[PDB]
Amino acid sequence: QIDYRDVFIEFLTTFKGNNNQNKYIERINELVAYRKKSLIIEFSDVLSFNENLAYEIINNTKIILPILEGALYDHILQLDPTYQRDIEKVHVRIVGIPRVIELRKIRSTDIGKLITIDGILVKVTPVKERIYKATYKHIHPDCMQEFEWPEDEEMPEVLEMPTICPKCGKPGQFRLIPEKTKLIDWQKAVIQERPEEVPSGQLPRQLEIILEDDLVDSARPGDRVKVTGILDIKQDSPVKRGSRAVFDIYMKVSSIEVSSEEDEKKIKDLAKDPWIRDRIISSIAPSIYGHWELKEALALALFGGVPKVLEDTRIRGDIHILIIGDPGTAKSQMLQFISRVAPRAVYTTGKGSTAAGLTAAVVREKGTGEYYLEAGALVLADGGIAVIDEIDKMRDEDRVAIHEAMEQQTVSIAKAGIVAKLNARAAVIAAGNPKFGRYISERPVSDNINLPPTILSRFDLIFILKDQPGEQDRELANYILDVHSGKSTKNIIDIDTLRKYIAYARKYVTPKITSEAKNLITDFFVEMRKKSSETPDSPILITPRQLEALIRISEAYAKMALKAEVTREDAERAINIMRLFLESVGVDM
Amino acid sequence: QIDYRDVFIEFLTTFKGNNNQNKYIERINELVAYRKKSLIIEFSDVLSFNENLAYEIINNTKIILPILEGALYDHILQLDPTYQRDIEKVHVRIVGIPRVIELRKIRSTDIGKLITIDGILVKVTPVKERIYKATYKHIHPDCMQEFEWPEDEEMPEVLEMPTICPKCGKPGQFRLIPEKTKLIDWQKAVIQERPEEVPSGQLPRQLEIILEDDLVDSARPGDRVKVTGILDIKQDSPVKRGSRAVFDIYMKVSSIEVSSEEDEKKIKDLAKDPWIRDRIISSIAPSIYGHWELKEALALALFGGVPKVLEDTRIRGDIHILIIGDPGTAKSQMLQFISRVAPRAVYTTGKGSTAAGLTAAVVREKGTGEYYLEAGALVLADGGIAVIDEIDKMRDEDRVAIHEAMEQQTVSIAKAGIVAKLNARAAVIAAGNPKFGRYISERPVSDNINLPPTILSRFDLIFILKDQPGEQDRELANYILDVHSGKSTKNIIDIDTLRKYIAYARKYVTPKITSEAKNLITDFFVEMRKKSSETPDSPILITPRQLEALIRISEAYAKMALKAEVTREDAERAINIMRLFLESVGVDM
DNA sequence: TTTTTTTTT
Ligand SMILES: [Mg+2]
Ligand SMILES: [Mg+2]
Ligand SMILES: [Zn+2]
Ligand SMILES: [Zn+2]
């Protein structure tokens, strides 16, 4: 009756964007440039342009989608005839569907229609190949005939061989020819519901999703995704009877998105403020009163330094923080916020974690009895932040397992005939209590901390928190009561904007040390060593690691302002913050 | 369409190398002399000669390799008819394909094409036999007929039996005839992607490869390889249905490289410089300031001594080094460099290693239920170097398991009805911290080291590193900042050249001890022992092993300069380095 | 059962 082929073509070439630039024309041209084969379409734009087409897509997806894909191919084909013989067909993916269903609310009425699901990826299988059009040869001394079996039909997910030879009308034995068989990429992944959606008491549930063609390897485990596609039932051996007419549910993904130009200008405008550093610092844990030096230190760990990769060695660029404090000083509240604003973070505790779970585990799969590696907490946090609450409660024989990952940023395993090395480039933030629960001033600093000097040298900054009831109790009491009353602080960057800001900085900014910063850093390091040698009593050691901590911190300060060079101003701040760190552990500079 | 037989023969006989020596002519003669049945052709040579031929090999590989193989066979057979009846057919292997694809980015479009993958070898199976042309016998009271079942076609990967007897056109049951069956060698290996190309937060992937004919047993596990061949889908159980329309992929290897005259010329001229020893020492860990004695000791372990094999016993020729130091003294950075410059090295840590994993593991195969052995780190490092970081962090019950491999260089297993003895000729490099993290000067050496005297006696050299701040801080700070600023030290042999130099020295050099060096070593050992008896409380003991250490070190010094005899000078250097080791551990000389 | 890495009484 009505053809949407023209409307779809009209929509793509005639659609004014936010800045009136025909964004979809630009997207198509970018697709031809690198042969992307996949085009992303916003549902809202289709609804804004022509509503009638929008309902057709969301309600008749299984029919109208192949029609649009063919129409798009011709339009691209006209733009570039050379697009052939490298790409044979394209894919149209739709995002922004309003039909969002919780993973626990799926019922029979939701099967067969395009829906959207939000969850967490937990398992990804290696990419494999699926046959969708096989080629067979009849093994019968008369035939020697080659044919494609699923004629006029895509081969189903259950393989089936012909029973009668089409070219001779005889039964017999058929042989598959891999050379003439058509294949498509295939990957299986498992999604899990968010903890915020799990009801009280029960464990989270899981759903199986299938990724095909270019959708494979689109995300890594631990990511938060929004999948869109068609639900369907799952079968393994339909021929194998014995009742059991009960089937599971699997999700046939058509478009996946993880976690725009408008953000860049929004981010770029933020960096133009001269007081951007102070605004960022004041935006860390707005619900916590005071602890200005601690808030500043946590900001540095989020940005980090510049890792240096050389032809012979590599230098760690991550910043590690240690906090020791009396109970009730909001150590854990701050760590919770960090795991929320960090683009990638893993939260663990000292008691609830083991040496094998922190780095890597060797397990025997019951399917084959063969040992294989399992990623640990530090490995999964690669490129992110690892948070280790209650570090003092962790067994010492287990805590030593992270010494290598803290400095060399690798995990080495030699167990059960498996020798492997895994990257663990993650920043470690840890908190804990002193030896006797509360800090005791009479005893020396050495026995209060109760940690080996080997692990203390691996932390760039160490802060000791003391809860002394003084004149600020009234200020603290009023601040807390305001939080419980719903009153909040304004003129602070929200979490979502801040998370976008940090991710941009860690990807496009790489400061360089200038000569002016070199002299200041060198002079202060020499001063450190002389002071430390004078008093060989403090439990901390001024090793060459402390010199590199100055370099890492200096780059982080420059990175927070999206600067390209480490000026003298950043060097002074880096020296200043470590002066406070040294004062905390009782070293007077 | 033009015949390429003449062009291929023309290229073989008329190609001029760097010296215009007709290199491939020499290769054919070597092939004829040794009956090697395999030819290696560099792709870039073919492209330079005839670009049209090079393209055809890349693209039309399925139906052009047998054509060239036949043409080459006739040329060889014409050259020497005696080559026939010894070699039925020859193989042409092409090396240097421009099409290189990472293991993780293989898609359906790459199946059926000649591609190159570079990875790490992991597992190798014993050589087996594959039937490529069967010979059955229709046993039926009237038939008694035998025949080659797959007619005018190679036997497929799937074992299939005839249904109708060709000699009588009747059904029945058939019996295989092993005597008349044709077989071909067959080996299965597993390759793994390199650690430097694994994406962040993910475990490495694996690919299955198949080696046939002379390609079997071309490499050992742990080797870095570059394989070239055709990808294909893998079929395991296609007789029974049940979906499973998803297939894995494997590789049909055509040519394999592991890890020349020009290099040997480069190495030879390097040793001509009288100061070659100092150049090599200065080239060890260029990013680390100072530690000249440590750098020199590490160079010796790279080269090693001369193992002696006698009719009654054998004496090890490897050098073991132990480093004890305060945290932050860059012990791990040097060990990382050693694992990268050595021709063969295995890197492990104290905490991430087990007694079974270091030497050998007994694992029960689930398929058959019988135990079998798996090679540990020391076995895999045979003929190379084993690096054990954080030696003091492993449990003493596990550390004691390497006493035999450290001296006798063998691993003995009496477990689960398996009695075996494996060679573990590997040099051990170890590092660790003192008992209290940092070295305590007031306490003696016995309580600082915290290791049993048995394992200490097995180490040729022991160096204690102390981090004392002093006047060298300013130069140390400047050196580190220059490294971070990108400045590089010149007059340094690069890693690749240095690795080639070490491999050549360990292979073609075997120094002999002269009389002059004999007298010097004897006098020092006697004088060393006499002073040892004066203070018997030291944890170190001057056993007869230390006499062997002097011999091994002296040979290593001679081997560093590609000398053939241990002159007087090399004995002097060996004594001096021993004095530093003794003086460092607290024994004056 | 017997050897192995792992969390658990
Ligand atoms: Mg807490
Ligand atoms: Mg170390
Ligand atoms: Zn037929
Ligand atoms: Zn017959």
Strand C contacted by A357 CB (< 7 A): yes
B-chain residues within 8 Å CB-CB of A310? 287, 483
d(CA A182, CA A483): 62
d(CA A526, CA B472): 9
Contact yes or no for A481/A244 (Cβ under 8 A): no
* Beta bridge partners of residue B123, listed in sequence order: B190
Give, for B47, the enclosing helix (H) or strand (E).
Answer: helix B43-49
Structure tokens given for B464? 């204690």
For residue B329, say whether it is annotated as part of any ligand binding site: yes
Instruction: Find, among A283, A376, A292, the residue nearest to A338 by Cα.
Output: A283
Rounded distance from Cα A181 to ligand 4 centre (Å): 34
Q: Which residue has the tokens 């989020």?
A: A302
Contact yes or no for A350/A460 (Cβ under 8 A): no
* Candidates A414, A513, A545; nearest CB to B352: A414
Half-sphere exposure of A496 (CA within 13 A, CB side): 3
Residues with CB under 5 A from ligand 3 (ion): A 138, 143, 165, 168
d(CA A491, CA A494): 9
Subunit contact A383:B200, Cβ cutoff 8 A: yes
Task: Please report, as a single letter, which amino acid is at residue B403.
Answer: H
Which bases along strand C come within 7 Å of a protein CB atom? Answer: 2-8
* Candidates B243, B364, B374; nearest CB to A369: B364
Contact yes or no for A526/B477 (Cβ under 8 A): yes
**CA–C1' B419–C1 (A):** 18
Structure tokens given for B342? 């050595």
Query: What is the residue-wise DSSP string for B105-122?
Result: G--GGGTTSEEEEEEEEE
Nearest residue in B to A385, CA atom: B201
Q: Which residue is nearest to nucleotide C1 (CA to C1')?
A: B416
Q: The domain A4-95 belongs to what CATH superfamily? A: mini-chromosome maintenance (MCM) complex, chain A, domain 1 (3.30.1640.10)
Subunit contact B202:A179, Cβ cutoff 8 A: no
Structure tokens given for B553? 């070190």
Task: List C-alpha distances in Å: B289 to A408, B190, B294, B333, B580.
Answer: 18, 41, 11, 11, 19
Structure tokens given for B419? 């009695």
Rounded distance from Cα B51 to ligand 4 centre (Å): 52
User: From the CA of B366, how many Å to the nearest CA of chain A?
Assistant: 6
Strand C contacted by B373 CB (< 7 A): no
Which residues make up the CATH 3.40.50.300 domain(s) of chain A?
263-585
Give, for A93, the enclosing helix (H) or strand (E).
Answer: strand A91-95
A-chain residues within 8 Å CB-CB of B201? 220-222, 375, 379-384
* Candidates A159, A381, A457; nearest CB to B243: A159
Q: Which nucleotide is at minimal CA–C1' distance from B363?
A: C3
* Candidates B329, B374, B480; nearest CB to A417: B374
Task: List C-alpha distances in Å: B406 to B316, B396, B456.
Answer: 9, 15, 11
Subunit contact B241:A369, Cβ cutoff 8 A: no
Task: Please report, as a single letter, which amino acid is at residue A224.
Answer: R
Structure tokens given for A336? 């919770």
Task: Please report, as a single letter, which amino acid is at residue A431.
Answer: A
Classify burial at B30, counting beta carbons within 10 Å of its beta carbon; exposed 0-12, middle 13-18, buried 19 or more: exposed
Q: Provide the strand spans (E) within A416-541.
A: 418-423, 427-432, 461-465, 512-513
DSSP annotation of A478 reads H
Which residues make up the CATH 3.30.1640.10 domain(s) of chain B?
4-95
Resolution in A: 2.7
**CA–C1' B418–C2 (A):** 12
Strand C contacted by B416 CB (< 7 A): yes
A-chain residues within 8 Å CB-CB of B247? 128-131, 183
d(CA A28, CA A73): 11
Q: Give the sheet arrangement for strand A385-389, strand by strand.
A: A345-349, A385-389, A427-432, A321-325, A461-465
Contact yes or no for B116/B95 (Cβ under 8 A): no
Task: Please report, as a single letter, which amino acid is at residue B531.
Answer: K
d(CA A144, CA A117): 49
For residue A133, say whether it is annotated as part of any ligand binding site: no
Residues 6 or more apart in contact with residue A508 via CB below 8 angstroms? none
Contact yes or no for B215/B256 (Cβ under 8 A): yes
Give, for B176, the enclosing helix (H) or strand (E).
Answer: none
Q: Which residue has the tokens 């190679």?
A: B154
Give the ligand at the shortest distance from the Cα of A174. 3
Strand C contacted by B508 CB (< 7 A): no
Rounded distance from Cα A509 to ligand 2 centre (Å): 30
Give the ligand at the shortest distance from the Cα of B391. 2
B-chain residues within 8 Å CB-CB of A458? 327
Rounded distance from Cα B142 to ligand 4 centre (Å): 8
Contact yes or no for B562/B509 (Cβ under 8 A): yes
Rounded distance from Cα B519 to ligand 2 centre (Å): 40
Query: What is the residue-wise DSSP string for B421-436?
Result: EEE---EEEEEE--TT
Q: Provide the strand spans (E) within B283-409.
A: 308-309, 314-315, 321-325, 345-349, 360-364, 371-375, 385-389
A-chain residues within 8 Å CB-CB of B285? 312-313
Classify burial at A402, counting beta carbons within 10 Å of its beta carbon; exposed 0-12, middle 13-18, buried 19 or more: buried
Classify burial at B424, counting beta carbons within 10 Å of its beta carbon; exposed 0-12, middle 13-18, buried 19 or more: buried
Instruction: Find, among B303, B459, B440, B287, the residue nearest to B388 by Cα.
Output: B459
* Candidates A369, A417, A541; nearest CB to B361: A417
d(CA B9, CA B30): 17
d(CA B208, CA B193): 12
Rounded distance from Cα A170 to ligand 3 centre (Å): 6
CB count, 10 Å around CB of A14?
A: 11
Give the ligand at the shortest distance from the Cα of B141. 4
Residues 6 or more apart in contact with residue B475 via CB below 8 angstroms? B289
A-chain residues within 8 Å CB-CB of B389? 404, 412
d(CA B574, CA B556): 9
User: From the CA of B341, how many Å to the nearest CA of chain A?
Assistant: 9
Structure tokens given for B545? 């092993």
Identify the experimental approach.
cryo-EM
Rounded distance from Cα B332 to ligand 2 centre (Å): 4
Helix B495-508 and helix B331-341: axis angle, to 10°? 70
Structure tokens given for B137? 């016998």
Q: Which residue has the tokens 């073509």?
A: A9
**CA–C1' B365–C9 (A):** 30
Contact yes or no for A18/A262 (Cβ under 8 A): yes
Give the ligand at the shortest distance from the Cα of A171. 3
d(CA A252, CA A229): 5
A-chain residues within 8 Å CB-CB of B484? 308, 315, 513, 548, 551
Strand C contacted by B357 CB (< 7 A): yes
d(CA A191, CA B182): 51
d(CA B464, CA B500): 31
DSSP annotation of B24 reads H
Query: Topology of A263-585 in CATH?
Result: Rossmann fold (3.40.50)
Phi-psi region at B96: left, alpha or beta (left = phi > 0; alpha = psi -120 to 50): left
Nearest residue in B to A402, CA atom: B351
Instruction: Find, among A63, A53, A66, A180, the residue nearest to A113 by Cα.
Output: A63
CATH number of A129-183: 2.20.28.10
d(CA B506, CA B499): 11
Query: What is the residue-wise DSSP string for B202-221?
Result: -PPPEEEEEEEGGGTT---T
Strand C contacted by B483 CB (< 7 A): no
Residues 6 or more apart in contact with residue B24 via CB below 8 angstroms? B11, B12, B13, B15, B39, B41, B45
**For testing contact with chain A, the best of B61, B103, B107, B487 (most A CBs within 10 A):** B107
Subunit contact B286:A178, Cβ cutoff 8 A: no
Task: Please report, as a single letter, which amino acid is at residue B194.
Answer: R
Q: Give the sheet arrangement for strand B145-147, strand by strand.
A: B145-147, B136-139, B173-174
